[PDB]
Design a protein around this ligand. Structure first.
Ligand SMILES: [Ca+2]
Ligand SMILES: [Ca+2]
Ligand SMILES: [Ca+2]
Length: 417
């Protein structure tokens, strides 16, 4: 859970609290890209929005509806030994917190829901583009009138339709009156804790940016009903959403390595240093996005951003010796100390000063066929690189790797600008 909170802690109790969740199915990227963009680009000014951007991260990493079965059928009866049991308890505890008032759960769904049968794509059994409640009223909730809230949220969404077929409709699943097998989902659990709970479906028939657009419209519609004041730093239209999903300023930082751009990496990065003795899901990974991760695939390690494959790492596992903190480098004739893990911009040249006990391998530069070269003490320019070794498709970013005996001492990237 990540908090979207006012800057003044005192403002947290001055409006309602919403819990916003997505990605309970790992192949529903509209939901988890919406929670991502909300975390990255919105501000909450009073009250609080608690966000679990992806409920089923292992499944997301494999572009899969649910590696351990349908996680959204696990909120009622559940075997204590179910692999998702611990996760389910964490989620139920968030839902049932006294400080939470409302719950919004995002999904992507086939076709377009209609309350009367129109055709195979548009009918009451389809799920796309509807706003869903379990029943019209939850007695004892802060906001018991789920129907009024839903109808008003639907008004907001429907003021912004991209095409008439995308019109949102209310779906009331009357869950408590239905079969036992229909009562196993997240929002029904939530209403049983006297929370107002809603699900938003965006149609799987839409491109990703349009799915995310509709999720964001539903989030904004509901925040307006709850009187949780907010801002965003962009205009909400599909082009603008697309631009932010596909933002060139997105980065990932693996372990103690430098930040790397997410987009336009080469599709495969070879001899890529990773810490040894560390299970892939335990390798530290930081990003300015909230849906980035690593996952093993055969002997490769995939860098995932939601369902998007950003690169395939071909790793070599090695001890990450943390002793080396900085390196004396000359950049465009200007001598300086460069921190291990940095990205440095180079207009013309660089030069690494020689070090006792440390060997530098500039990846893409060579002066011999030596397998473990020391390339400190060379003045290096763009023309000296075999471009195929660049980190990026643009052939501008190169790795410098440092070694102390048989251990890895760190990496610095150079970016030719
Ligand atoms: Ca922004
Ligand atoms: Ca779903
Ligand atoms: Ca080299």
């Amino acid at each position: 859970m990540i908090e979207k909170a006012p800057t003044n802690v005192e403002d947290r109790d001055k409006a309602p609290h919403l819990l916003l969740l997505a990605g309970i199915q790992g192949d529903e990227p509209g939901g988890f890209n919406a929670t991502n963009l909300f975390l990255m680009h919105y501000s909450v000014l009073k009250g609080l929005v608690e966000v679990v951007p992806v409920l089923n991260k292992p499944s997301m990493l494999r572009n899969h509806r649910g590696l351990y079965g349908d996680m959204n059928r696990k909120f009622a009866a559940l075997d204590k030994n179910d692999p998702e049991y611990p996760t389910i308890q964490e989620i139920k505890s968030l839902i049932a917190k006294p400080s939470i008032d409302a719950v919004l759960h995002l999904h992507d769904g086939g076709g377009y829901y209609r309350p009367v049968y129109v055709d195979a794509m548009l009918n009451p059994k389809r799920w796309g583009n509807c706003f869903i409640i379990d029943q019209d009223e939850v007695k004892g909730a802060k906001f018991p009138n789920l129907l009024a809230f839903a109808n008003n949220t639907i008004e907001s969404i429907n003021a912004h339709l991209l095409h008439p077929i995308e019109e949102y409709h209310l779906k009331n699943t009357r869950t408590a009156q239905g079969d036992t097998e229909m009562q196993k989902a997240l929002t029904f659990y939530a209403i049983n804790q006297k929370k107002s709970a809603f699900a938003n479906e965006a149609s799987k028939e839409l491109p990703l940016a349009s799915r995310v657009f509709y999720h964001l419209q539903a989030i904004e519609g509901l925040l307006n009903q709850l009187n949780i004041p907010f801002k965003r730093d962009f205009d909400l239209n599909p082009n603008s959403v697309h631009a932010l999903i596909n933002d060139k300023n997105l980065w990932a930082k693996i372990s103690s390595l430098p930040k790397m751009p997410l987009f336009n990496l080469r599709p495969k990065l070879n001899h890529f240093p990773l810490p040894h003795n560390t299970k892939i899901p335990q390798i530290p990974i930081e990003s300015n996005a909230y849906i980035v991760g690593l996952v093993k695939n055969k002997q490769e390690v995939f860098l995932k951003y939601g369902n998007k494959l950003m690169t395939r790492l071909s790793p070599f596992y090695i001890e990450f010796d943390p002793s080396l903190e900085e390196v004396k480098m000359q950049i465009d004739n200007k001598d300086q100390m460069v921190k291990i893990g940095s990205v440095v911009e180079v207009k013309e040249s660089f030069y690494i000063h020689a070090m006792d006990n440390i060997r530098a391998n500039v990846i893409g530069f060579s002066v011999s066929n030596e397998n473990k070269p020391n390339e400190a003490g060379y003045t290096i320019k763009f023309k000296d690189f075999q471009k195929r070794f660049s980190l990026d498709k643009q052939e501008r970013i190169y790795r410098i790797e440092f070694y102390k005996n048989n251990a890895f001492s760190g990496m610095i990237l150079v970016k030719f600008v």
